[PDB]
Design a protein around this ligand. Structure first.
Ligand code: NAG
Ligand code: NAG
Ligand code: NAG
Ligand code: NAG
Ligand code: NAG
Lengths: 50, 50, 50
């Protein structure tokens, strides 16, 4: 079964300044007072989040 | 892990406790002797261990 | 140099998880036929072959 909903208010999405969000834990390890340099799949700061 | 990037604490997977791993406690051997003509006995110094 | 040699080796891993359903395939009262065989796919578990 499938019914056409229609009423498509076709509006474009906007852009927002992603400031510092999107930082996760790159590995499964504990570090205490350690500044660690990683390289992994990340979201850059001040990005254009939709 | 630590600043030197080595394993020093692991999580016990059955009982959820946190242990720490202090190393194998090796060291050097320094032998304190007079001359062979003077005497024949030595003293042994172990480098920096309890 | 002196190194404190290890006394024993211990292997510690996570507790036994959910078992694979070998009880259903082996202790069923009535099995199927030869031309019609029930293909059961078993995954996401540890297979106890003991
Ligand atoms: C919804 O409308 C479109 C318009 O072309 C049509 O192609 C489609 O079949 C319709 N959906 C259903 C479920 O009939
Ligand atoms: C991305 O964000 C910046 C900051 O507001 C903005 O100037 C720029 O136009 C945006 N990019 C697009 C394609 O709109
Ligand atoms: C694993 O089994 C032990 C019993 O030896 C139990 O004390 C422990 O809580 C179990 N682990 C988990 C995560 O339940
Ligand atoms: C031991 O005795 C004296 C004092 O060191 C020295 O002059 C002598 O040559 C030595 N004798 C040996 C090493 O045989
Ligand atoms: C070894 O460690 C204990 C623990 O406090 C200490 O009392 C003792 O003095 C230490 N001995 C040496 C030789 O470092």
């Amino acid at each position: 079964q499938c019914v056409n909903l229609t009423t498509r208010t076709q509006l474009p999405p906007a852009y927002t300044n992603s400031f510092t969000r999107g930082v996760y834990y790159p590995d499964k390890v504990f570090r205490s007072s350690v500044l660690h340099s990683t390289q992994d799949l990340f979201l850059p700061f001040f990005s254009n989040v939709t | 892990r630590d600043i030197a990037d080595t394993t020093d604490a692991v999580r016990d997977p059955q009982t959820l406790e946190i242990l720490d791993i202090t190393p194998c406690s090796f060291g050097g051997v320094s032998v304190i002797t007079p001359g062979t003509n003077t005497s024949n006995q030595v003293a042994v110094l172990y480098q920096g261990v309890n | 140099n002196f190194r404190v040699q290890p006394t024993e080796s211990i292997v510690r891993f996570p507790n036994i998880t959910n078992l694979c359903p070998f009880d259903e395939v082996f202790n069923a009262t009535r099995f199927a036929s030869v031309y019609a065989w029930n293909r059961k796919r078993i995954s996401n578990c540890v297979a106890d072959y003991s």
